[PDB]
Amino acid sequence: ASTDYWQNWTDGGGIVNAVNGSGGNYSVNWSNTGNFVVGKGWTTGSPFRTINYNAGVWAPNGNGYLTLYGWTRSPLIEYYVVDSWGTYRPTGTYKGTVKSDGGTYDIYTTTRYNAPSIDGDRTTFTQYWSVRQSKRPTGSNATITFTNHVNAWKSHGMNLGSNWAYQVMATEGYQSSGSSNVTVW
Numbered sequence: 638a639s640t641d642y643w644q645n646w647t648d649g650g651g652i653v654n655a656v657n658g659s660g661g662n663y664s665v666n667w668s669n670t671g672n673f674v675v676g677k678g679w680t681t682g683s684p685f686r687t688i689n690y691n692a693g694v695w696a697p698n699g700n701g702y703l704t705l706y707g708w709t710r711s712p713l714i715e716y717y718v719v720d721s722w723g724t725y726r727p728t729g730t731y732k733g734t735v736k737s738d739g740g741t742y743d744i745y746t747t748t749r750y751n752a753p754s755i756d757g758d759r760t761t762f763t764q765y766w767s768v769r770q771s772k773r774p775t776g777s778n779a780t781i782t783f784t785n786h787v788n789a790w791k792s793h794g795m796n797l798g799s800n801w802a803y804q805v806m807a808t809e810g811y812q813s814s815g816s817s818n819v820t821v822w
């Protein structure tokens with residue numbers, strides 16, 4: 638599919654060289670950053686969407702995530718489907734597991750306090766996570782059947798908002814350095 642959304646947010650720390658490439662391709666070079674999120678996807682997320690991607694390059698030197706990323710409103714929720722990471726595997730309150738697209742993911746919930754959000758300024762919101770138990774190999778055509786995660790979260794009381802915001806396959810970093818090149822469709 639054709640992506641129609643370009644996500645490029647940084648809290649201003651360090652260097653984040655984000656390149657909006659052709660089609661669903663994008664690349665990122667970062668060094669000594671604060672927090673940032675870059676990726677391509679869709680302006681309006683969907684619980685039935687099937688995301689395809691190929692990370693030709695995944696080279697984080699520290700804390701970085703290769704993950705499906707999106708938001709909903711009513712209520713405000715930041716969700717993730719982490720396929721790979723750097724030196725830190727994200728975790729939180731364990732809720733259970735879900736098998737999808739050849740891998741097993743742990744389900745977690747966390748909370749952010751006085752943090753930036755899509756609504757601007759700062760607020761408190763919940764984060765839904767699906768983290769692969771082991772890093773997914775990159776360089777191949779990978780698929781994320783989001784509906785599998787959405788349904789698994791629901792069975793654990795993890796309901797998303799009724800107002801869908803953007804949905805992208807992104808690269809998130811935190812006080813680290815690295816490189817990535819991803820193609821989304």
Ligand SMILES: *[C@H]1OC[C@@H](O[C@@H]2OC[C@@H](O)[C@H](O)[C@H]2O)[C@H](O)[C@H]1F
Nearest residue numbers: 646672674715749752753754755757
């Ligand atoms: C999850 O990821 C980073 C951050 O979200 C950003 O908030 C500001 C908004 O304009 C950007 O589009 C978002 O990516 C959030 O604090 C964190 F919990």
